[PDB]
Amino acid sequence: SESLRIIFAGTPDFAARHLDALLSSGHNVVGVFTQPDRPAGRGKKLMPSPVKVLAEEKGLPVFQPVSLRPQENQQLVAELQADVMVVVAYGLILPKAVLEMPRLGCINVHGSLLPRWRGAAPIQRSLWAGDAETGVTIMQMDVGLDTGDMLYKLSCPITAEDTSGTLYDKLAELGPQGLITTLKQLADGTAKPEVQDETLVTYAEKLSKEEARIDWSLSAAQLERCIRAFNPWPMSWLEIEGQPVKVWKASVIDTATNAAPGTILEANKQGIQVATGDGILNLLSLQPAGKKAMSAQDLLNSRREWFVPGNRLV
RNA sequence: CGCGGGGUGGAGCAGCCUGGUAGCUCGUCGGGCUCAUAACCCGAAGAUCGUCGGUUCAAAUCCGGCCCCCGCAACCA
Numbered sequence: 400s401e402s403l404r405i406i407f408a409g410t411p412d413f414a415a416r417h418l419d420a421l422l423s424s425g426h427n428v429v430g431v432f433t434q435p436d437r438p439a440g441r442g443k444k445l446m447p448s449p450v451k452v453l454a455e456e457k458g459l460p461v462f463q464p465v466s467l468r469p470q471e472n473q474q475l476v477a478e479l480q481a482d483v484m485v486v487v488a489y490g491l492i493l494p495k496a497v498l499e500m501p502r503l504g505c506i507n508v509h510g511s512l513l514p515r516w517r518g519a520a521p522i523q524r525s526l527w528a529g530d531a532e533t534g535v536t537i538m539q540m541d542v543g544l545d546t547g548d549m550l551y552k553l554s555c556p557i558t559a560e561d562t563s564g565t566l567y568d569k570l571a572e573l574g575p576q577g578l579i580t581t582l583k584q585l586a587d588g589t590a591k592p593e594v595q596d597e598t599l600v601t602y603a604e605k606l607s608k609e610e611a612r613i614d615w616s617l618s619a620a621q622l623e624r625c626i627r628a629f630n631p632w633p634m635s636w637l638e639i640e641g642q643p644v645k646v647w648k649a650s651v652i653d654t655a656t657n658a659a660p661g662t663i664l665e666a667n668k669q670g671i672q673v674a675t676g677d678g679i680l681n682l683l684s685l686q687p688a689g690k691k692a693m694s695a696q697d698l699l700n701s702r703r704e705w706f707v708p709g710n711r712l713v
Numbered sequence: 714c715g716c717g718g719g720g721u722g723g724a725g726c727a728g729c730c731u732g733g734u735a736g737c738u739c740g741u742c743g744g745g746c747u748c749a750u751a752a753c754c755c756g757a758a759g760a761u762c763g764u765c766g767g768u769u770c771a772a773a774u775c776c777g778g779c780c781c782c783c784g785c786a787a788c789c790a
């Protein structure tokens with residue numbers, strides 16, 4: 400019985416779950432790697448990171464290499480003589496020298512059912528593209544991008560009310576659980592790797608505010624998904640008087656229209672119906688810059704002029 | 714030292730600049746009316762204006778300290 404010496408590499412809260420998990424699970428995390436502290440969030444104050452914060456607390460060795468391309472840095476890994484490196488939501492890329500350093504190499508917890516949604520935003524993209532389900536996949540990291548053999552998976556269906564925040568939460572339960580279970584297999588040698596079927600390969604491009612800016616050209620349905628896939632970030636928004644209004648909730652009304660997309664059709668307690676490339680999107684919850692999310696009703700009771708029927712939104 | 718908006722009956726807002734004067738659009742309850750209504754009309758309840766203190770005959774308004782909320786940006790992948 401020797402706990403696998405583990406190097407953990409992660410940044411966001413999603414990683415923190417996995418780390419906190421390994422610890423409470425009784426593993427030996429020799430070192431932790433995150434992104435270097437930076438300005439973040441009104442005031443641009445130097446903020447730690449979700450992962451680091453947890454580490455500091457647990458009194459774990461932190462390593463914040465700006466990159467792992469540099470020899471000096473790649474050494475920080477090998478100097479730890481680890482059995483395996485668990486990677487989860489880590490910005491930095493891992494050079495071949497590093498992937499080979501751990502006795503068992505590096506394994507990554509990917510938020511998608513590979514080979515599908517290889518990339519940076521598999522969670523949001525899955526929900527965005529309409530997928531019926533999603534989940535994690537613990538993989539042996541190879542070279543490139545999420546190309547390594549897959550060891551373990553766990554799936555969960557995507558409801559129709561799930562945002563990306565809720566999907567993250569759901570996978571924050573499966574993830575660790577899958578990670579642990581796989582690490583034991585790795586330790587016992589009972590790991591049974593699979594190879595990726597290149598035909599079923601789709602990539603999950605990162606998110607951006609531009610893509611978030613509501614595009615009425617798109618079907619009401621694609622937007623309905625955006626409005627949920629882009630939550631909590633960046634949040635589907637539309638511009639009103641050179642102002643960003645974030646759209647939190649929007650149902651889809653199924654009754655076609657020939658009006659030019661962006662055209663407001665109705666505006667009542669039931670929501671603000673707007674024409675789209677196909678179908679009519681029905682804004683139910685909007686957030687006026689500097690305010691909170693509110694109901695179409697609450698919003699119309701003071702900005703009725705923002706959504707008058709006949710007018711058009713861009 | 715990053716830029717910026719906001720905290721007023723239950724809800725969304727105006728009122729502040731140029732001190733007195735409680736507004737607007739709704740919700741709620743009662744009544745009126747229609748075949749009926751989520752529609753209209755009339756009435757009512759309901760706010761020590763975020764908090765503490767100062768000027769003041771008098772403060773939502775002008776001055777100071779504080780707590781809270783949000784937008785950009787930044788950040789995470």
Ligand SMILES: *C(=O)[C@H](CCSC)NC=O
Nearest residue numbers: 487488489510518519790
């Ligand atoms: C980011 O580059 C990628 C997505 C993580 S899935 C939450 N993996 C990082 O380790």
Ligand SMILES: [Mg+2]
Nearest residue numbers: 720721722763
């Ligand atoms: Mg109040």
